[PDB]
Nucleic acid binder design. Structure first.
Ligand SMILES: [Zn+2]
Ligand SMILES: [Zn+2]
Ligand SMILES: [Zn+2]
Ligand SMILES: [Zn+2]
Ligand SMILES: [Zn+2]
Ligand SMILES: [Zn+2]
Lengths: 86, 84
DNA sequence: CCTTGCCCAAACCCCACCC
DNA sequence: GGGGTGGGGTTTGGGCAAGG
């Protein structure tokens, strides 16, 4: 029908479903390699793209061995999650 | 009627044929205005509305003369097939 | 039975926002 | 040579049964 919170007209009900997920902070699609979750499956696919591409180098973390396809992303992960021992 | 591949029981045999097309991969219904093909005639009927409706504005591709109903789809098609 | 249209989740993609 | 996420939107695949 219509957005019960913001009153936005949607031509598709699935888009209204994901919009209501954004309003309610619902993230059903959770990553299996970290704590990240998102409201859309395509978001999860794009996120898993950052955990290492097929045929590409992977920078595993020194602490929890979390895979990353970009060194800067691994550095950010270490700075954000592994500051308990600095 | 039960699927010979996954064993799903249907209350309608035509549903079994359409579902089995997913296992076999056959796509009998092929669009005449693009490369799209599907296993269900109704899906092709729905897809044909992306090329435009009678009386509505239609954006035809400048190179391959492919009609479109949504300019966003036309832009995506131009990026996909015409990088020159 | 067979058509067909609807419902919903899922795919793909573009653009804007963030750290 | 930035890399990744959130919002937004078209389109598509799978399913299902009411009514031809
Ligand atoms: Zn809303
Ligand atoms: Zn992750
Ligand atoms: Zn780590
Ligand atoms: Zn099957
Ligand atoms: Zn087509
Ligand atoms: Zn074209």
């Amino acid at each position: 029908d219509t957005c019960e919170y913001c009153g936005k007209v949607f031509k598709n009900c699935s888009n209204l479903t994901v919009h209501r997920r954004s309003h309610t902070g619902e993230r059903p699609y959770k990553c299996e390699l970290c704590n990240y979750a998102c409201a859309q499956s395509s978001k999860l696919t794009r996120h898993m793209k950052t955990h290492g591409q097929v045929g590409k180098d992977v920078y595993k973390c020194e602490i929890c061995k979390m895979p990353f396809s970009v060194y800067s992303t691994l550095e950010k992960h270490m700075k954000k999650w592994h500051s308990d021992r600095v």
